[model samples]
Target: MSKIEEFLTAEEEKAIVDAIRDAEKNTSGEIRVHLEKTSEIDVFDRAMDVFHNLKMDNTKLQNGVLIYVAVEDKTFVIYGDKGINDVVSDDFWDTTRNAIQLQFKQGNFKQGLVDGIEKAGMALAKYFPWKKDDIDELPNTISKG
Candidate 1:
């Protein structure tokens, strides 16, 4: 088959969505997870396209993160906007990526995404702490490509 019939189970998807909601609780930053059946070209390019299409680029602080997964290709990308990129440390993103990789390598994709989202939120909270009136700029739903 050219497409993945099941990118994530219902329970798995709920876990990731919950993680996203929890992660955004203390930061002004936005986070999104996207899963696709396949990506034959550069994953980064496709991720950027999806990122913008989702209006993630329109965040108030430009501090958005996208975790893009291409199941059929067995690849994923953690993308950050210029604002978050400017503040986080060199190894910050790596640690997040590694967290997801750790779980995914063992077939725990739900925990993998949770780990990544939470880690990214940790850094974002430090740099962009929640204000009294901060709003959620992105939907917590997982987009399909």
Candidate 2:
């Protein structure tokens, strides 16, 4: 079987599409989501492709789209628009990505997407709260208070 066929089931594909739709419904702007199924363990290239194609500024890129791939384990590639890089750190990505990957490894794709989206959403809310009428806004302060 092909790499995509090997890693992604129909149900998994549906779940991913649903997650992206849900994110769009909840947010103000469009947030694209992409999935790749790879036979090899590494999916960094796939992640970068999604990020590169997004064509968002550093801040919006960081805050907007989320890319997830299924290998032996789940891998996430999140791009931040340029401005967001100053605020979001590599450690944040490591922690958040690993958390999402762990949920997928445990066979909880739905929960993984929900949790990951919520976590990332909260971070974005801190920086941009224009959607407060639709979603709860996190405080603007970086201290997480």
Candidate 3:
């Protein structure tokens, strides 16, 4: 296992993996998560290329992955799927990104994820008001199961 993988408990790893799998199963499109040690110029260039070249709905890209890159510091980036991004607002992403940045600055990965998940839930609820309860319970299910 990599250093970051080692840092996470087996349950934590399983939860992440399972969430990705669930996303794939639930969506017609694929979901992917990436972790990188360094976000050097080369990495940034590659990511930008991905951002520019991909033709699919950019919104879909957001739901596909929960990317946690620990270059010099921990940085969390969530790519929501089409199902999520189309309905969510730019303000939602801004809030989530800021929350993650704040938690990372404090060296609290767990707290960062918690805040991100809560924000995501709220965004989803805003989009699918009928499913508010379901969306709210998702994070707890993932963590506990």
Tell me the tens digit of each residue's lDDT in model 2 across 39-81. Answer: 3434556555556664443443344454554444455555544
Report clash pairs, candidate 1: none
Error of 2 at 51 (Å): 2.6
TM per model? 0.89, 0.57, 0.53
How far out, in Å, is residue 49 in model 1?
1.9
Candidate 3 lDDT by residue in tens digits, 11-112: 766665554444433333333334455554554554544433542245423443333455445655566445566756787788878876898788766566
lDDT by residue (tens digit), candidate 1, 1-145: 2335766778878878888898778898888878777776788898888888877878878888888987765667888888888888778778887888888888766778888888778877877887888898888988777
Off by more than 4 A, model 1: 1-4
Q: Arrange candidates by TM-score, highest first: which order?
A: 1, 2, 3
The C-alpha local distance difference test score for the whole of candidate 2 amounts to 0.52
Q: Could you say which candidate leads in lDDT?
A: 1
Instruction: Estimate the lDDT of model 3.
Output: 0.50
Clashes of each: 0, 12, 6
